[PDB]
Structure 1
């Protein structure tokens, strides 16, 4: 019955992927950003310049006040609000209704985005990182406990306005090609994984693989960029610069501060390399790789001029909180968050970006010794 959930995600380019939900009785419709990088379900519940609608607790007969405050600081953006519960449904999801914890956002700082068309956030990660503490049951945990929905979901993010699918409770085989390759969920807090090798245009970065996961590596649909620890970021940028030295870019471009433009249809995709991330596999000494095309880490933007030039932003950036496999990574793939079996699957997405001669890939098996040494402690 998954066909009803295909194409249930929308968004504007670079503004966040959202799914439609209803909260309260009678149902109040809101668009909710899907975020595997956090664990709180929160909705705007008071006027805001960027909000065109919000949750009105007074109009819901099933609203229950929890008489407790809450605040969530993200890497970018934060909000505070009032905790409570209410009935929640997903129109283009399973035909169920669950009583879920809801953070009623009353105040926020650089969280909501003008024109994004979403009014809340669905944190799909685990209770361990929920605010104020791990006793606040996340939405998906409530869903699984109260209904017969199986304990897994899958995400197909289709980049550029944007679209995709969140298959709640299963895998839709029509959404991917080839085989699914699985990596263990190292620990149930973020969707933490272990990267065991990195190659750029087939050239090994030859770093101690712990550097790739310092201090963690997560799969995060709530972040655009591939974010890399300082040491890995510098090595990656050095290698990407060398492959594209044919042309010149301001240094601010490599910091994500400036755009680069080319005459429409003349973007030199061939001079930008592919990046392969090797992930720990399911059997001893076995890994697999996912390969990223430059079309994924060079995001198209709006030409600030009155021209038809193709302009792009560099979407690999430095991190101090470990690797973040954001939308830049996820958009190429069908990603299965198999919570029941504590693993994450990757397969080539049916809505992958096309290069004229190269293709994003998920390939295995590979042999990799001592993969456990790559996890940081």
Structure 2
């Protein structure tokens, strides 16, 4: 089997992407944030505290003839950005782009943090990291991809995120028309439960490529590119007027600037992030100070190849017995 679903930016900045997901019988379609940095499929629901729902579409398990409470199971997750959610668990039929999994754990939110409530466009998350990170207790549950893997034509999914445009998540096949050149594959460590890999270096604009190992994670659920302070300083030094602002929370630059590109290495291959992808616009409405899309990871503990980086590539998440990542230009 295979599946193919379009993923759409939630706003004009590409802050996140939503993909329609069919849950239950008859189908209830929710728009989920596919997140290769986490491993829970959780949804706003009829169980979510009413004051914490503000425009989201909810899953109502009592209206699904295939929903079954997973007795005793609870979940609770906290994300790198400080947001969180928690609740109980059903199993139900879940379909993405024509690919159906029966008995998928659907984690129903009883509580969500304010950042989720305030974002009416995201109805939940669909985690695509390794199932070892799933938070369901006392019996950890499998991700949608893990459940689908054996049925797929090939045990892979691909992320093709658009710049200010829709893109595609495919399951079970590699669309050879969706990228240019070849796909360069690189080794993955699953020791932390992430799609963790080592970039071979970087360049700023037309500058020389610096060969240096940068360990990080491929994370579709993170907006920006978070890299070591040395690398980030070298990037922003090429933008006149750029400065790290403790009060704003990162690097900011004059909105009148033209940003240089940023290249990262994948083995001997190179992925070029155009400068425009690094512009996240005014820090507040009407400001001439703009927020940068490359930021320091120094306070995170891990480097994160988020959407800024991934949207410049066609990315293969190869879930074979020994997983690997692939990157192609597009």
TM tier, smaller: 0.7 to 0.9
Task: Quote how far apart the aligned CAs of 1:125 are.
Answer: 1.0
Matched, 1:316 2:320: no
Q: State the partner residue of 1:227.
A: 226
Q: Which structure 1 residue ranges, 5 or more long, are not aligned?
A: 282-286, 350-377
Distance change >3 Å, CA 22–CA 137, structure 1 → 2 = same
CA distance in 1, matches of 2:152, 2:258: 50
Within 1, Cα distance between the matches of 2:236 and 2:158? 34
Residue in structure 2 matching 1:275, options 262, 276, 286: 262
3-state SS in 2 of match to 1:32: strand
CA drift at 1:206: 6.8
TM-score, length-scaled by structure 2 = 0.85
Which residue of the partner structure matches residue 324 of structure 2?
A: 343
Structure 2 equivalent of residue 122 of structure 1:
126
String of CA shifts for 1:223-268, please: whole Å, max 9, x gaps: 011112xxx22x2233234322xx3245429943756322xxxx43
User: TM-score, normalized by length of structure 1?
Assistant: 0.75
Q: Any unmatched runs of 5+ in structure 2?
A: none
Give the structure 2 partner of residue 296 of structure 1. Answer: 277
Show CA shifts across 1:310-349 (max 9, x none). x742122222321100001011111111112621111112
| Alignment counterpart, residue 196 of structure 1, candidates 188, 192, 200 | 200
1:169 and 2:147 aligned: no
> Which protein has the larger Cα radius of gyration, Structure 1 or Structure 2?
1
Aligned partner of 2:94 in structure 1 is: 88
Whole-angstrom distance in 2 between the partners of 1:193 and 1:81: 32
CA distance in 2, matches of 1:142, 1:155: 18
| Contact kept in structure 2, 1:50 and 1:112, CA below 8 Å | no
RMSD over equivalenced CA pairs, Å: 2.8
Q: What number of residue pairs does the alignment pair up?
A: 316
1:50 maps onto 2:54 in alignment: yes
Deviation sequence 1:143-198 (CA, Å, 0-9, x none): 224x34531111111022x4110111111122111111111122262001012333
1:6: Cα distance to partner?
Answer: 6.2
Contact 1:154 1:335 in 2 (8 A): yes
1:32 aligns with: 32
